[PDB]
Design a protein around this nucleic acid. Structure first.
Ligand SMILES: [K+]
Ligand SMILES: [K+]
Ligand SMILES: [K+]
Ligand SMILES: [K+]
Ligand SMILES: [K+]
Ligand SMILES: [K+]
Ligand SMILES: [K+]
Ligand SMILES: [K+]
Ligand SMILES: [K+]
Ligand SMILES: [K+]
Ligand SMILES: [K+]
Ligand SMILES: [K+]
Ligand SMILES: [Mg+2]
Ligand SMILES: [Mg+2]
Ligand SMILES: [Mg+2]
Ligand SMILES: [Mg+2]
Ligand SMILES: [Mg+2]
Ligand SMILES: [Mg+2]
Ligand SMILES: [Mg+2]
Ligand SMILES: [Mg+2]
Ligand SMILES: [Mg+2]
Ligand SMILES: [Mg+2]
Ligand SMILES: [Mg+2]
Ligand SMILES: [Mg+2]
Ligand SMILES: [Mg+2]
Ligand SMILES: [Mg+2]
Ligand SMILES: [Mg+2]
Ligand SMILES: [Mg+2]
Ligand SMILES: [Mg+2]
Ligand SMILES: [Mg+2]
Ligand SMILES: [Mg+2]
Ligand SMILES: [Mg+2]
Ligand SMILES: [Mg+2]
Ligand SMILES: [Mg+2]
Ligand SMILES: [Mg+2]
Ligand SMILES: [Mg+2]
Ligand SMILES: [Mg+2]
Lengths: 181, 260, 186
RNA sequence: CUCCGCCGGCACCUUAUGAGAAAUCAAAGUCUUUGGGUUCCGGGGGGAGUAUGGUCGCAAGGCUGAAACUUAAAGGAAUUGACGGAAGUGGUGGAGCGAUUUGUCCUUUGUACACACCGCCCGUCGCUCCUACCGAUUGAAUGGUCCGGUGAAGUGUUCGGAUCGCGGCGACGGCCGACGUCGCGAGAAGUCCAUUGAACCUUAUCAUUUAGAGGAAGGAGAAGUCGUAACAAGGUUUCCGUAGGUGAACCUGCGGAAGGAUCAUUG
RNA sequence: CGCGGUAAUUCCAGCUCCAAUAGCGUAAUUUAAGUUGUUGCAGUUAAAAAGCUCGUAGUUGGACCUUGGGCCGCGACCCCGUUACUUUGAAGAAAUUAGAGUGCUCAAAGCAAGCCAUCGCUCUGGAUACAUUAGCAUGGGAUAACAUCAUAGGA
RNA sequence: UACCUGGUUGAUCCUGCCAGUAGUCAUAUGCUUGUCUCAAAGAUUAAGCCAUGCAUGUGCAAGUAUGAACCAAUGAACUGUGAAACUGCGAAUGGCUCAUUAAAUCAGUUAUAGUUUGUUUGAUGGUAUACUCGGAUAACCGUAGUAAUUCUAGAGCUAAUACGUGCAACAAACCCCGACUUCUGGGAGGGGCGCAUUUAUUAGAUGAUGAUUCAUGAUAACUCGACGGAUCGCACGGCCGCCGGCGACGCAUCAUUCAAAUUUCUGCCCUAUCAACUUUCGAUGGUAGGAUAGGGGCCUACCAUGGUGGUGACGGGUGACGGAGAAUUAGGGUUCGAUUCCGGAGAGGGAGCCUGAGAAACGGCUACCACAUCCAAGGAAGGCAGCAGGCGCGCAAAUUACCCAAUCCUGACACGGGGAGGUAGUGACAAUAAAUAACAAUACCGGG
């Protein structure tokens, strides 16, 4: 026996049943361009996560409002949706969880929030800035653009202290240029 | 197989040990002893996983070979010694004494006890019958044989045993209205008073227990352990006081603690 | 070797059972002791499961026999095997098995009866106890007529192939009548 | 005879509020708003109701019933047109799921044709390949069972007693040592019977693999030949069952069906 | 399904464009399949009602028997036949699955961890749900099955 | 995401299949392949054959040292540390594989009032030269044999917690016989009596269970009883030679624990072109035995004629180990389940055993069949479906690496050992994250 065999893993996305439908291709490309995604799989995994959350919410809506599992798991689901900024305060019911779209999840990415915070000129500039290790959430630098930012962590998105845009020293391009000068 | 198994695969270990899935291929197989393998907490687990005194298997060996650990007043050097319910674990160097009780989630918890309270354990009488020479003798579920027991003591009774003198100093008759702790099943660690005993000829006997807050639960006779005469247990209980909480109330407690 | 497994048997429906495992040692059988009545006493040590001991008598000539109505037990010589209920082959071979009917020497029981009752089949205390015992004394005249010949009909109640001993009881009453009818019909 | 009812029966007419692919059906209705009970029975078209096994039958045959292989359709209802060796162009509205149709009163009718009868098409015989079947040779090869035996080795048991110890009686020689003497104990080889029993040989059987002269199918492909059996009343209306005959499609006899070319003679 | 016989949107290429993307193509099983149909298919003419009837097993079987009522107060009150079924309880290993908590930088994961920094603390956490059928126990008796069911010859 | 699209026609609506479309902890293969995390990996065909190496040994103060062993000390039995060897224990776990096996394994659920159980834990132990018995033997030493092997003979020594003996610290009670006594009794004396074994008689009321002639007591005997300490370490004090602590190891009994064995009910794929099967020679039941740890046709003798079957017996097929589970799933369902957890089974095929608490063991033995190795031809030695690796087979699968540091197991043991297991290597099985550019200005195209 190898102990490593017991580590779990799973798939994060599915491919569409119809590969070449014009309407779906246009909608996916519109979302990808709006949020600077690297491929369709990044949107497909968000759709996969939304599908699992929606299935959970629907299954508790098909149970009584006194069923102790619906009180408990619906409270947990609402806490998770409020924690990541996916739901407002007035939207405090399991019904509103069913109304969530992949747009709501894509709007909470570190790339989208870095772009909307003014730190980057474009969504693609935000993507490169995050992948260049210039962005920290709290004290932790995050080089992963699909990072889902909590509302309590939104106000702590900032330039890295080791980055030239965050008080750090100049990068190798600038330093080499001044050394040439 | 052609004989006894010497190894316990880690996946096949008791779930109340809370052993992690990727810590290795193996779990400590409990040695034979006073308690059953599936219902005990081995000494190595207590020393390394629970008390954090040792960090490795070898460190547990080093601690135990120093003769630092006494189980129910006696020095044990076996790491897989099957310490079980109500056992006294004493370390007479740091001056700390532990009674192995169950929390309401079915997991053994080392409960700190006073020096005087570590001088006795509670044992459950398994059977009373005549031994050789016609001498009456008592046996318990923790493997002890006591000769010349009080004739008023019957099977399923709880006796109070003084570890220093090794005699029955007091006992409790298994009656309706005595506070009990469930030691097996899904209600393990729950504390309540017996309301009635439903007997069925030829099969297991069902005990109906109601806790202090009013919740009612039922369990077999083999999973009931009397801990006090009346509504006052003879030992101290862990923080939960044997009152199981639903996950909603646990979430309420967590929310209140986070808010504070 | 000899096995005790249900593997080789047919099913209760008559269907054959295909073997799914070789013979295990924990289901073995051993060859019978076939204890003979002979004055060449031989009991062999058989090492069995658990490191325990079984005594395997091969030849026996003496046994411990109980006279139940008298509540007396004496060691007596085995003289002959007369009746077996499972096989007369065991009678002709003089095989000692549990529940076999044998002839045993009546001399120890005669001696005990004389000593205890004063009756053959020197103090005031001794004579008083003897008269107290003789009051109500009743023999059954069948045991008496076999005492005349010095041979008592007995049933081997021990298993010689297991315990190495040929012990039993003296036949009395209805069992005695049954076995006398069997022996006269033989 | 007449009239009005009730029950039951063979049917008929109209109508859709129904169903249906429609034809049509008052059940073929009460079906995605899906569940009264129950039996049989179908799963693209061929191969095929064929092979083989079984069973029934005198036989003819009946019942049960494949596979390999082959193929992209076959088939149903209806529409328009064309053909018959059958008879005598929008709009809007309406009908139809629809192609269409009404309007427009050559028409009706049949169609397996739609390249539209100079159509479509069936079968034998030729010739190239593929698959499967039967098939003597009591065809072989492989393994399993059945019957008899032979039977290693172990285990238990019976004798056996190489040998080794412990002692013994008395004695001899100088505690040791040798011999004769006599008990106990252990005990190897060997040996006896029993048991388990590998494995070997024998008979037959089963399960395989399996050549096979020859016979005889089916399919595909070129595609020749002889005709024209199916489609029009297809030129003898078609077909079902059974029997006989014929180069082949087929023909004929007897009974049956319209899936007919007649829903029709109170005349 | 089709394309290719001189104008090839289909072959061989160039250019351009499209899909997925560090991946994608090609050669049993699930879905699609309500084309196996219990939910949920068909059987006049498309494949499919046995020629017809009887008949055992199997499957399916008409109606009928303690109801009302009020009071207190959703419980209660008043005027030694079984089984299916249902309810509740105990079990039904762990891992896997569902799911609570937790910022491994994210994630797949893991069962960790967290705390102004603490010679320590949070008793830190290490939940819970599911688990056919069969077995055990509790309540219910509407529906249904079996056994009886005018020598009751009853008590 | 509870989904359809092309294809029969001149056109239509159907039936219906073909084809497409998505997944696979699903295999192979092709092309391509920068980074991070994660990770399957000679199952499918051959449970085919294997060169070589390794995978099981083990020592505490506490069984046994006189190495002609080492350090340190320098008239004393034994300093200490100790190789070797005897003794003890282990090697029945783990790892591997899925061939056989279709109410069989196995799953859930029972049962042992039908049994065994080294060990752990707890309790228990009285009637059998002693200031302590005997003979061997290894290591050692030196004569060898053989081509040869942990193949082997002879000689000289010497230990025990090896082996074999033997006092077993003492006692009451109880039972039997019983001289004498003056006597329904008293009673000397003699015998039995530990624990275990076997049988028999008896008590167990009106201690225990749902239930036992049960636990258990008493009695009579029985057994040629491997039982009832001739062992070791540390400390060594108290009374005047006698007592004396803390341990270690070992024997036996019961209980407990670790388990097994057997066992109750229910549940398994396809096939009737398998409808009868089983029963001489066990098939179903009964009686008495034998055997076994124990129930039982498990076997034997005798007896009876039963037992199963369309609610599918029996037979056949399975490219069938069972389950937990896996893939796909609106629901229902379909298909898979060699593989890391549980259970079972096997170690080329059969069979048979020894040791041992535990094996019908195969990194144990014996034999046959099949392969096959060395040979000096006289013999000798075999079992990778352990790890790695190699042939072969195939569509199809990695290094003859390092290590006990983790997990844990095992031994006399805190220390040794562990191809269990881990670490690295190969590795687009599968899975996760994620680069291959971003910005600005000119010029263009623009649009607003
Ligand atoms: K076993
Ligand atoms: K009428
Ligand atoms: K019109
Ligand atoms: K014709
Ligand atoms: K016609
Ligand atoms: K051993
Ligand atoms: K089971
Ligand atoms: K038995
Ligand atoms: K019997
Ligand atoms: K052993
Ligand atoms: K280690
Ligand atoms: K160790
Ligand atoms: Mg229907
Ligand atoms: Mg068909
Ligand atoms: Mg119109
Ligand atoms: Mg014609
Ligand atoms: Mg004609
Ligand atoms: Mg091109
Ligand atoms: Mg259909
Ligand atoms: Mg037709
Ligand atoms: Mg038809
Ligand atoms: Mg009814
Ligand atoms: Mg569906
Ligand atoms: Mg194993
Ligand atoms: Mg008794
Ligand atoms: Mg018997
Ligand atoms: Mg197989
Ligand atoms: Mg499996
Ligand atoms: Mg296989
Ligand atoms: Mg493998
Ligand atoms: Mg396994
Ligand atoms: Mg085995
Ligand atoms: Mg092999
Ligand atoms: Mg073997
Ligand atoms: Mg091996
Ligand atoms: Mg092995
Ligand atoms: Mg590149």
């Amino acid at each position: 026996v190898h102990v490593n065999f017991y580590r779990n893993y799973g798939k994060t996305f599915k491919k569409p049943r119809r590969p070449y439908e014009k309407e779906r291709l246009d909608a996916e490309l519109k979302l990808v361009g709006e949020y600077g995604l690297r491929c369709k799989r990044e949107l497909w995994r968000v759709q996969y996560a939304l599908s699992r959350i929606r299935n959970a919410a629907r299954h508790l809506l098909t149970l009584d409002e006194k069923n102790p599992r619906r009180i408990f798991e619906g409270a947990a689901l609402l806490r998770r949706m409020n924690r990541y900024g996916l739901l407002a305060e007035g939207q405090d019911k399991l019904d509103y969880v069913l109304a969530l779209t992949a747009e709501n999840f894509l709007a909470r990415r570190l790339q989208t929030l870095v772009f909307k915070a003014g730190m980057a000129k474009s969504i693609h500039h935000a993507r490169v800035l995050i992948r260049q290790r210039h962005i920290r959430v709290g004290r932790q630098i995050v080089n992963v653009p699909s990072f889902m930012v909590r509302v309590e962590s939104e106000k702590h998105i900032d330039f890295s202290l080791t980055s030239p845009f965050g008080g750090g020293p100049a990068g190798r391009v600038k330093r080499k240029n001044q050394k040439k000068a | 197989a052609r004989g006894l198994k010497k190894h316990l695969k880690r996946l096949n270990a008791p779930s109340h040990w809370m052993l992690d899935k990727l810590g290795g291929a193996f779990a400590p197989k409990p040695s034979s002893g006073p308690h059953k393998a599936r219902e005990c907490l081995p000494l190595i687990l207590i020393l390394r996983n629970r008390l954090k005194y040792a960090l490795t298997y070898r460190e547990v060996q080093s601690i135990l070979m120093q003769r630092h650990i006494m189980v129910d007043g006696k020095v044990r050097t076996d790491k897989t010694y099957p310490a079980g319910f109500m056992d006294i674990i004493s370390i007479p160097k740091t001056g700390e004494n532990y009674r192995l009780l169950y929390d309401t989630k079915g997991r053994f918890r080392l409960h700190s006890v006073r020096d005087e309270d570590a001088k006795f354990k509670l044992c459950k009488v398994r059977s009373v019958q005549f031994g050789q020479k016609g001498i009456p003798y008592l046996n318990t579920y923790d493997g002890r044989t006591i000769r010349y027991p009080d004739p008023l003591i019957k099977a399923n009774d709880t006796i109070k045993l003084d570890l220093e003198t090794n005699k029955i100093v007091d006992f409790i008759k298994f009656d309706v209205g005595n506070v009990v702790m469930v030691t097996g099943g899904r209600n393990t660690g729950r504390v309540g008073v017996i309301k009635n005993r439903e007997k069925h000829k030829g099969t297991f006997e069902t005990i109906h227990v109601e806790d202090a807050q009013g919740h009612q639960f039922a369990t077999r006779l083999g999973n009931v352990f009397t801990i006090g005469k009346g509504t006052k247990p003879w030992v101290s209980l862990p923080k939960g006081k044997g009152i199981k909480l639903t996950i909603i109330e646990e979430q309420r407690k967590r929310d209140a603690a986070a808010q504070a | 070797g000899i096995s005790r497994d249900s593997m080789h048997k047919r099913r209760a429906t008559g269907g054959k059972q295909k073997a799914w495992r070789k013979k295990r040692k924990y289901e073995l059988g051993r060859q019978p002791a076939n204890t003979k009545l002979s004055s060449n006493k031989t009991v062999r040590r058989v090492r069995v499961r658990g490191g325990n001991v079984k005594w395997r008598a091969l030849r026996l000539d003496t046994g411990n026999f109980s006279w139940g109505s008298e509540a007396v037990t004496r060691k007596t010589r085995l003289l002959d095997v007369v009746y077996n209920s499972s096989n007369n082959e065991l009678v002709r071979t003089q095989t000692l098995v549990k529940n076999a009917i044998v002839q045993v020497d009546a001399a120890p029981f005669k001696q005990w009866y004389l000593t205890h009752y004063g009756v053959e089949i020197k103090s005031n205390n001794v004579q008083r106890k003897l008269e107290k015992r003789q009051q109500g004394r009743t023999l059954d005249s069948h045991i008496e007529e076999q005492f005349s010949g010095g041979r008592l009909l007995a049933c081997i109640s021990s298993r010689p192939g297991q315990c190495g001993r040929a012990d039993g009881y003296i036949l009395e009453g209805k069992e005695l009548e049954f076995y006398m009818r069997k022996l006269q019909k033989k």
